[PDB]
Amino acid sequence: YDDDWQYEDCKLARGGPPATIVAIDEESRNGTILVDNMLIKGTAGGPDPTIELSLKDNVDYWVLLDPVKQMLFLNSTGRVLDRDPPMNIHSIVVQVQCVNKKVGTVIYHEVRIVVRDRNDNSPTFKHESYYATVNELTPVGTTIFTGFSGDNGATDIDDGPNGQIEYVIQYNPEDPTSNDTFEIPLMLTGNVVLRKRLNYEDKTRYYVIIQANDRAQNLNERRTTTTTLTVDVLDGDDLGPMFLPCVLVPNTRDCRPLTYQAAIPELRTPEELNPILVTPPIQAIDQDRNIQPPSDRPGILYSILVGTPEDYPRFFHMHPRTAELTLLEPVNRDFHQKFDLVIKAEQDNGHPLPAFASLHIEILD
Amino acid sequence: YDDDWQYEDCKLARGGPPATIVAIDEESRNGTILVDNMLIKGTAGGPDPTIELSLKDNVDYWVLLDPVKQMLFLNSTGRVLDRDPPMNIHSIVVQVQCVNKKVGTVIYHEVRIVVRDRNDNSPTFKHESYYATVNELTPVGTTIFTGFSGDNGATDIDDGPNGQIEYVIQYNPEDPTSNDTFEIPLMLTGNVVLRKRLNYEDKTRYYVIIQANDRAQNLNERRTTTTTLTVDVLDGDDLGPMFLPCVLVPNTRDCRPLTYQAAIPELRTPEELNPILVTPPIQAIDQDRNIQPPSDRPGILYSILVGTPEDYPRFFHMHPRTAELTLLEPVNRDFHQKFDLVIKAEQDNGHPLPAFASLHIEILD
Ligand SMILES: *[C@@H]1O[C@H](CO)[C@@H](O)[C@H](O)[C@H]1NC(C)=O
Ligand SMILES: *[C@@H]1O[C@H](CO)[C@@H](O)[C@H](O)[C@H]1NC(C)=O
Ligand SMILES: *[C@@H]1O[C@H](CO)[C@@H](O)[C@H](O)[C@H]1NC(C)=O
Ligand SMILES: *[C@@H]1O[C@H](CO)[C@@H](O)[C@H](O)[C@H]1NC(C)=O
Ligand SMILES: *[C@@H]1O[C@H](CO)[C@@H](O)[C@H](O)[C@H]1NC(C)=O
Ligand SMILES: *[C@@H]1O[C@H](CO)[C@@H](O)[C@H](O)[C@H]1NC(C)=O
Ligand SMILES: *[C@H]1O[C@H](CO)[C@@H](O)[C@H](O)[C@@H]1O
Ligand SMILES: *[C@H]1O[C@H](CO)[C@@H](O)[C@H](O)[C@@H]1O
Ligand SMILES: *[C@H]1O[C@H](CO)[C@@H](O)[C@H](O)[C@@H]1O
Ligand SMILES: *[C@H]1O[C@H](CO)[C@@H](O)[C@H](O)[C@@H]1O
Ligand SMILES: *[C@H]1O[C@H](CO)[C@@H](O)[C@H](O)[C@@H]1O
Ligand SMILES: *[C@H]1O[C@H](CO)[C@@H](O)[C@H](O)[C@@H]1O
Ligand SMILES: *[C@H]1O[C@H](CO)[C@@H](O)[C@H](O)[C@@H]1O
Ligand SMILES: *[C@H]1O[C@H](CO)[C@@H](O)[C@H](O)[C@@H]1O
Ligand SMILES: *[C@H]1O[C@H](CO)[C@@H](O)[C@H](O)[C@@H]1O
Ligand SMILES: *[C@H]1O[C@H](CO)[C@@H](O)[C@H](O)[C@@H]1O
Ligand SMILES: [Ca+2]
Ligand SMILES: [Ca+2]
Ligand SMILES: [Ca+2]
Ligand SMILES: [Ca+2]
Ligand SMILES: [Ca+2]
Ligand SMILES: [Ca+2]
Ligand SMILES: [Ca+2]
Ligand SMILES: [Ca+2]
Ligand SMILES: [Ca+2]
Ligand SMILES: [Ca+2]
């Protein structure tokens, strides 16, 4: 038991916890009052003080004390009280030491100054730009970009909601359909989902403007940074062959074929006549003009699909890769005056998507 | 300093660490020798022993001691020394207590029996079966199933390689193309990737047999469990309309249209004649017969694409949704004897994939 602790000098004349806890905003002005009055019993002033007050553990001298008023001030001339990196000052803790002069006892009064975050930083993207490719056959609802994952996206150095990031697509006045074609359903991840079906024939590149905004409680205080995600559409196999030559029908993408022509002298043999010349030459090309890589491009199979009269298979053979037409036996014109055949060109990859053209063959007297 | 510790009795007559460390396989027989000889100096036998030996900390009585031979045995009658759950006995630790009888000193000799894992457990799948759906337009290389993720896959309760799981596709003799169509490139995840392009018209369900095997060092000792991943293909919009009626060309999927027919009496007015009857009625349907959901199904647009003579737009109008044909002005047969028109039916969804049919119109005297 000690009689020296029975005094009230050096003890706090307030309710609450032993620590004196206060809060100020980061980056507060020099001279900002931290504690207006410590409320420590006793007097440090006068010619016969009963107490002596001083600061201990005043790291980097952030706090100044007036021992008579028992007032603490922020010392920040020439510097900034930054809560964010690189400083990371989330609180300032110091001790007010009080000595009771009558008996020499010492008491420390902790002071904790909580430094409140301001939203003084904007999101920064890891990269200057972002890029994705998407095959045009990709179904709607496919997640086509995850490139903000694993901190490759945006970071904000503020605390709490001030540092939380939401990714949102903006309307792009320079590419008005991009915000209709793509969506970010989960703001917290920034992953981009295909919202509308693509068509390589119509549009092959999109500029998707993606903002990253912080979540400050006050909308007027939120900060925003933008990036562009460039999406290139890759040509997919949604179209089949088209015969050449063709004429485009005005106001359409339908390039219609001609009727191919051939003529066979009656009674001459295949040895004499083959190969049978067709005018213009039968050819077709894939309406998908930029399939990559080249090894994914299909071959085209040519055939005589149907024809009139229906005995044409007795007389004609078409090479399936070259479309070369050969005669199989001599033609007696008493029995066979002409043929009208339908030629098919289709892909050899299980997705035939055929085109059709007519071939007229005259038998000559 | 104590003279009582200057004796060799109760100390180990061997090199190595203070703990006596040995290993046995899990599930070892009752009576399995754990330590053949503790090598403790002194004699516990005879009528004047210099030491006394006993076991301490013998949890659940797994160890038996012969104090004279200094031999330890496994006590496992009626039970199993299981290293795996539910027992989880990875080691057995007991103390051999030695008392030096001349001076009463006590020394404990730790014995650690490491229980080695056997590969006595097979992988178990969380679920009886697994299921995925895949739109047929999905590009090759798409990861189409991740359903083993987050422990929804297979678990093995053995330790180390004995408990590691590899997921591998097996050839399915009941569905021989499924192991060609899908692949698991990362054995450790079991995620399934589309390896070959789908076609709903050809195949709509696959049974993919997926084994989960453990990684026991000896192939003969590895354990395997199988599951089936059922994959259903969803019909996608890769095909356009087809006109009806049609006749299928033998050995093909090409259902060719007829030439539609109409006849218009000369000089009668549109009021008198409309609508112009076409035989058979012009109709088309989507060659994709099971697009889901119904709201994704496109409408069909009908039009007169081209025609001869080329003044037909002065005379005829086709309703784009119903294909109804109307006359726009009376027809003078001195100037117009017949028309041969090409009708197009295409989808209205930006992927027209058109079909074409002929329409012959006679002007009647
Ligand atoms: C900074 O604040 C302290 C405390 O009020 C004050 O003593 C000092 O004069 C101030 N310095 C300047 C340059 O204003
Ligand atoms: C105020 O802070 C600055 C920087 O730490 C320091 O140089 C100065 O000595 C401090 N002033 C006082 C009165 O503690
Ligand atoms: C895209 O931006 C425009 C203009 O702000 C807006 O009308 C439209 O609703 C947006 N589209 C989507 C899918 O949000
Ligand atoms: C089990 O093993 C111990 C130690 O060898 C032995 O004493 C005991 O007889 C054995 N019990 C049976 C039932 O074999
Ligand atoms: C052997 O283990 C069983 C099960 O713990 C126990 O009942 C028995 O008492 C033990 N025997 C000895 C000799 O310790
Ligand atoms: C599928 O299984 C068969 C038979 O084992 C085998 O020939 C074929 O190579 C396998 N396919 C793939 C893609 O591994
Ligand atoms: C693609 O993946 C994202 C998640 O990364 C989903 O949000 C989306 O629905 C799609 O499955
Ligand atoms: C920055 O600006 C964007 C709009 O461009 C807001 O969404 C955000 O709240 C912040 O004010
Ligand atoms: C991201 O995009 C927005 C809108 O174009 C710009 O305001 C910003 O400067 C950044 O380029
Ligand atoms: C990203 O880049 C696009 C142009 O490529 C801009 O329009 C946008 O403002 C952002 O800087
Ligand atoms: C997406 O990336 C392209 C370059 O690949 C840029 O041109 C565009 O501005 C956007 O950043
Ligand atoms: C789908 O996603 C898996 C990983 O989950 C990849 O292994 C695969 O290449 C594809 O991108
Ligand atoms: C179980 O059986 C499979 C083959 O079906 C092996 O891959 C595995 O090593 C284990 O022996
Ligand atoms: C998984 O599939 C394999 C092969 O069909 C079977 O052997 C096993 O019983 C399980 O059904
Ligand atoms: C999974 O299920 C299929 C049949 O649905 C079996 O063939 C296979 O053996 C496994 O049991
Ligand atoms: C995949 O799932 C189907 C049922 O949806 C089963 O029929 C098949 O055996 C496999 O387990
Ligand atoms: Ca700051
Ligand atoms: Ca801040
Ligand atoms: Ca911020
Ligand atoms: Ca294409
Ligand atoms: Ca193609
Ligand atoms: Ca076991
Ligand atoms: Ca085991
Ligand atoms: Ca195992
Ligand atoms: Ca389809
Ligand atoms: Ca369709």
Side-chain angles (χ1 to χ4, degrees):
Chain A
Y1 186 77
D2 211 307
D3 289 330
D4 297 2
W5 294 108
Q6 288 305 301
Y7 302 98
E8 294 189 282
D9 303 82
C10 284
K11 297 180 183 184
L12 303 188
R14 60 162 178 79
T20 298
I21 298 165
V22 297
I24 56 163
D25 282 356
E26 58 165 317
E27 316 210 353
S28 284
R29 281 168 347 229
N30 179 74
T32 298
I33 296 173
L34 308 173
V35 175
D36 302 71
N37 188 344
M38 289 286 295
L39 296 171
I40 296 168
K41 218 100 195 201
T43 46
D48 303 292
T50 61
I51 64 175
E52 312 168 17
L53 299 176
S54 59
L55 292 173
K56 298 299 189 153
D57 297 335
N58 188 18
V59 172
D60 295 337
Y61 304 108
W62 284 110
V63 182
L64 305 170
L65 164 71
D66 178 341
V68 177
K69 297 185 117 175
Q70 306 193 3
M71 193 171 217
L72 297 182
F73 305 84
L74 180 68
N75 167 20
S76 181
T77 308
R79 58 179 171 174
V80 181
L81 177 59
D82 195 2
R83 188 189 196 279
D84 310 303
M87 290 187 29
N88 301 307
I89 296 169
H90 296 185
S91 65
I92 296 160
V93 180
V94 300
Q95 307 288 329
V96 174
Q97 171 183 285
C98 180
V99 174
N100 175 346
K101 294 181 71 97
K102 328 171 164 152
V103 285
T105 51
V106 180
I107 287 181
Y108 299 99
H109 294 298
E110 181 157 299
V111 175
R112 302 176 184 154
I113 298 109
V114 175
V115 180
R116 300 188 292 239
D117 191 43
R118 295 184 58 78
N119 197 35
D120 56 341
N121 294 279
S122 297
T124 60
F125 282 94
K126 187 66 133 189
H127 307 291
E128 282 181 358
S129 61
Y130 292 88
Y131 181 78
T133 60
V134 182
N135 190 293
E136 66 178 315
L137 291 178
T138 297
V140 173
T142 300
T143 296
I144 59 83
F145 169 81
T146 56
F148 302 146
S149 71
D151 303 82
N152 264 290
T155 299
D156 191 307
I157 68 178
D158 295 316
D159 194 58
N162 293 337
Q164 299 176 9
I165 301 277
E166 288 172 339
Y167 298 96
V168 167
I169 287 178
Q170 302 192 344
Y171 173 74
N172 192 351
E174 295 185 349
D175 201 21
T177 72
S178 69
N179 78 305
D180 291 319
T181 298
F182 300 93
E183 64 176 299
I184 295 183
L186 278 66
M187 289 189 295
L188 286 176
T189 71
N191 290 344
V192 174
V193 176
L194 183 62
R195 177 176 178 278
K196 287 179 94 164
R197 186 175 178 182
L198 301 168
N199 191 328
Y200 188 85
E201 181 60 34
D202 294 331
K203 188 163 167 65
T204 65
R205 171 173 283 200
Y206 295 79
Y207 298 104
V208 181
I209 287 160
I210 295 170
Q211 78 180 43
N213 62 260
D214 57 25
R215 300 191 65 254
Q217 303 224 292
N218 186 319
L219 291 182
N220 292 327
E221 297 177 354
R222 288 185 172 191
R223 282 165 172 256
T224 309
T225 304
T226 64
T227 199
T228 295
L229 163 64
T230 299
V231 184
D232 271 334
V233 182
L234 307 179
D235 195 356
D237 179 26
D238 60 320
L239 309 172
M242 51 179 290
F243 282 100
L244 300 186
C246 61
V247 184
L248 259 179
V249 178
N251 305 304
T252 80
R253 287 170 192 178
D254 304 301
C255 194
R256 306 305 282 146
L258 265 60
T259 283
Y260 294 102
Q261 301 294 336
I264 303 209
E266 79 164 312
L267 304 165
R268 307 236 217 120
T269 69
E271 304 89 10
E272 290 181 293
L273 304 177
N274 281 324
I276 301 310
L277 176 72
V278 176
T279 305
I282 294 168
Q283 48 181 319
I285 62 174
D286 187 354
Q287 291 178 69
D288 298 311
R289 313 190 139 170
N290 192 30
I291 298 285
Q292 299 294 337
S295 74
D296 278 347
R297 297 167 186 170
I300 291 174
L301 296 166
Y302 299 96
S303 57
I304 307 167
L305 176 73
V306 295
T308 308
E310 63 210 307
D311 59 348
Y312 63 88
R314 302 221 317 271
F315 293 97
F316 303 106
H317 179 263
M318 181 164 282
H319 190 292
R321 299 300 196 168
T322 68
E324 186 184 66
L325 178 67
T326 45
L327 181 72
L328 301 176
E329 59 192 59
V331 187
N332 181 323
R333 198 177 177 275
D334 281 346
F335 298 96
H336 315 272
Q337 291 92 44
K338 59 181 184 162
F339 293 84
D340 291 287
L341 309 182
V342 176
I343 305 314
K344 177 173 71 163
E346 70 183 11
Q347 307 189 134
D348 65 2
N349 65 353
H351 297 263
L353 299 165
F356 308 94
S358 299
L359 164 62
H360 179 83
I361 301 175
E362 281 288 328
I363 309 307
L364 308 181
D365 199 328
Chain B
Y1 186 77
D2 211 307
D3 289 330
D4 297 2
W5 294 108
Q6 288 305 301
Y7 302 98
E8 294 189 282
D9 303 82
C10 284
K11 297 180 183 184
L12 303 188
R14 60 162 178 79
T20 298
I21 298 165
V22 297
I24 56 163
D25 282 356
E26 58 165 317
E27 316 210 353
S28 284
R29 281 168 347 229
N30 179 74
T32 298
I33 296 173
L34 308 173
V35 175
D36 302 71
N37 188 344
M38 289 286 295
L39 296 171
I40 296 168
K41 218 100 195 201
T43 46
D48 303 292
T50 61
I51 64 175
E52 312 168 17
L53 299 176
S54 59
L55 292 173
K56 298 299 189 153
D57 297 335
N58 188 18
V59 172
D60 295 337
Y61 304 108
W62 284 110
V63 182
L64 305 170
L65 164 71
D66 178 341
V68 177
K69 297 185 117 175
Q70 306 193 3
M71 193 171 217
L72 297 182
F73 305 84
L74 180 68
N75 167 20
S76 181
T77 308
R79 58 179 171 174
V80 181
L81 177 59
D82 195 3
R83 188 189 196 279
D84 310 303
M87 290 187 29
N88 301 307
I89 296 169
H90 296 185
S91 65
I92 296 160
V93 180
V94 300
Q95 307 288 329
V96 174
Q97 171 183 285
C98 180
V99 174
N100 175 346
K101 294 181 71 97
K102 328 171 164 152
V103 285
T105 51
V106 180
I107 287 181
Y108 299 99
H109 294 298
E110 181 157 299
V111 175
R112 302 176 184 154
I113 298 109
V114 175
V115 180
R116 300 188 292 239
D117 191 43
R118 295 184 58 78
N119 197 35
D120 56 341
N121 294 279
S122 297
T124 60
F125 282 94
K126 187 66 133 189
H127 307 291
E128 282 181 358
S129 61
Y130 292 88
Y131 181 78
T133 60
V134 182
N135 190 293
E136 66 178 315
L137 291 178
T138 297
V140 173
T142 300
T143 296
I144 59 83
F145 169 81
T146 56
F148 302 146
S149 71
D151 303 82
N152 264 290
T155 299
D156 191 307
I157 68 178
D158 295 316
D159 194 58
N162 293 337
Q164 299 176 9
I165 301 277
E166 288 172 339
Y167 298 96
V168 167
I169 287 178
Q170 302 192 344
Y171 173 74
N172 192 351
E174 295 185 349
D175 201 21
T177 72
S178 69
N179 78 305
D180 291 319
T181 298
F182 300 93
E183 64 176 299
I184 295 183
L186 278 66
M187 289 189 295
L188 286 176
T189 71
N191 290 344
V192 174
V193 176
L194 183 62
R195 177 176 178 278
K196 287 179 94 164
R197 186 175 178 182
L198 301 168
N199 191 328
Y200 188 85
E201 181 60 34
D202 294 330
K203 188 163 167 65
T204 65
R205 171 173 283 200
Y206 295 79
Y207 298 104
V208 181
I209 287 160
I210 295 170
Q211 78 180 43
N213 62 260
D214 57 25
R215 300 191 65 254
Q217 303 224 292
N218 186 319
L219 291 182
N220 292 327
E221 297 177 354
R222 288 185 172 191
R223 282 165 172 256
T224 309
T225 304
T226 64
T227 199
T228 295
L229 163 64
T230 299
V231 184
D232 271 334
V233 182
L234 307 179
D235 195 356
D237 179 26
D238 60 320
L239 309 172
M242 51 179 290
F243 282 100
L244 300 186
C246 61
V247 184
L248 259 179
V249 178
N251 305 304
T252 80
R253 287 170 192 178
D254 304 301
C255 194
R256 306 305 282 146
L258 265 60
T259 282
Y260 294 102
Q261 301 294 336
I264 303 209
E266 79 164 312
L267 304 165
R268 307 236 217 120
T269 69
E271 304 89 10
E272 290 181 293
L273 304 177
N274 281 324
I276 301 310
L277 176 72
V278 176
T279 305
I282 294 168
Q283 48 181 319
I285 62 174
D286 187 354
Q287 291 178 69
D288 298 311
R289 313 190 139 170
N290 192 30
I291 298 285
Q292 299 294 337
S295 74
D296 278 347
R297 297 167 186 170
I300 291 174
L301 296 166
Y302 299 96
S303 57
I304 307 167
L305 176 73
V306 295
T308 308
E310 63 210 307
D311 59 348
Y312 63 88
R314 302 220 317 271
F315 293 97
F316 303 106
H317 179 263
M318 181 164 282
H319 190 292
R321 299 300 196 168
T322 68
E324 186 184 66
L325 178 67
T326 45
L327 181 72
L328 301 176
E329 59 192 59
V331 187
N332 181 323
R333 198 177 177 275
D334 281 346
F335 298 96
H336 315 272
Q337 291 92 44
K338 59 181 184 162
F339 293 84
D340 291 287
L341 309 182
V342 176
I343 305 314
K344 177 173 71 163
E346 70 183 11
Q347 307 189 134
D348 65 2
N349 65 353
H351 297 263
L353 299 165
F356 308 94
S358 299
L359 164 62
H360 179 83
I361 301 175
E362 281 288 328
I363 309 307
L364 308 181
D365 199 328

